[PDB]
Design a protein around this ligand. Structure first.
Ligand SMILES: CC(=O)Nc1nnc(S(N)(=O)=O)s1
Ligand SMILES: [Zn+2]
Length: 257
């Protein structure tokens, strides 16, 4: 079905998901000079101290770490959000080289990878209903640049061997997502969509200004993953990112000046 190759890549997605050419598609390029500082925007409130990770899984497009979202144990609120959003999973998008990999870009600059922490608005009851609403999800986006190792990402890096191919999964408990956060929580925000099919326009994007750095050896491990299932020809999982989409009639607000 869909993927990131030339025959099923992002340029082909519109044929099965017409909304690919919609009005609030993601990702986008963040032009730092036309972004509007908005002093009425509140600080983000990330409460991940009760977070419960359960499993890590290679879904053939990326790898996801899933959390128990049966109760308000890891939530996001504040910022441009109203209500509570529960963390359901986080995943990454990365490139084949260090100069590409992120989905969002800042003044056209691409980062080595991009981490997405996905949350759904609890007023909707479950994830499936939330994706059907304009204010259903809140995704926290964090850029990764190659530099020094991120201690808090190593646990994730070491388990990849066990989920090398599509469909593989592994128990992944007691992982603390707080170890992936940059020091500052300043951000840009705009209304957008999921960056993979079905590309629903149900997301309030919150992109952090400050990147976290990971080491070259850490990102290398990501690139060893496979898109294919076991027993199939090896297709390295790299460049699983969608290019920037037209901003159209949207404004990017910044929480800092
Ligand atoms: C279960 C789930 O989170 N679905 C998603 N699909 N694309 C997403 S992204 N790239 O916009 O964060 S999240
Ligand atoms: Zn994503």
């Amino acid at each position: 079905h869909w993927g990131y190759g030339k025959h099923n890549g992002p340029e082909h997605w519109h044929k099965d998901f017409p909304i690919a050419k919609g009005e609030r598609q993601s990702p986008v390029d963040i032009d730092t000079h036309t972004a509007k500082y908005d002093p009425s925007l509140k600080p983000l409130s990330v409460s991940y101290d009760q977070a419960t990770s359960l499993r890590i899984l290679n879904n053939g497009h990326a790898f996801n770490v899933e959390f128990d979202d049966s109760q308000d144990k890891a939530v996001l609120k504040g910022g441009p959000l109203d209500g509570t959003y529960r963390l359901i999973q986080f995943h990454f998008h990365w490139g084949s080289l260090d100069g590409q990999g992120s989905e969002h870009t800042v003044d056209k600059k691409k980062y080595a990878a991009q981490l997405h922490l996905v949350h759904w608005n609890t007023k909707y009851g479950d994830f499936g209903k939330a994706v059907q609403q304009p204010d259903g999800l809140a995704v926290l986006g964090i850029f990764l640049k190659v530099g020094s190792a991120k201690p808090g990402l190593q646990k994730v890096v070491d388990v990849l061997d066990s989920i090398k191919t599509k469909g593989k999964s592994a128990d992944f408990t007691n992982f603390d997502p707080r170890g992936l956060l940059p020091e500052s929580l300043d951000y840009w925000t705009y209304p957008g969509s999921l960056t993979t099919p079905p590309l629903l326009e149900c997301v309030t994007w919150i992109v952090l200004k400050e990147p976290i750095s990971v080491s070259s050896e850490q990102v290398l491990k990501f690139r060893k993953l496979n898109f294919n299932g076991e027993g199939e020809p090896e297709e390295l999982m790299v460049d699983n990112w969608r290019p920037a989409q037209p901003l159209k009639n949207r404004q990017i607000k910044a929480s800092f000046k």
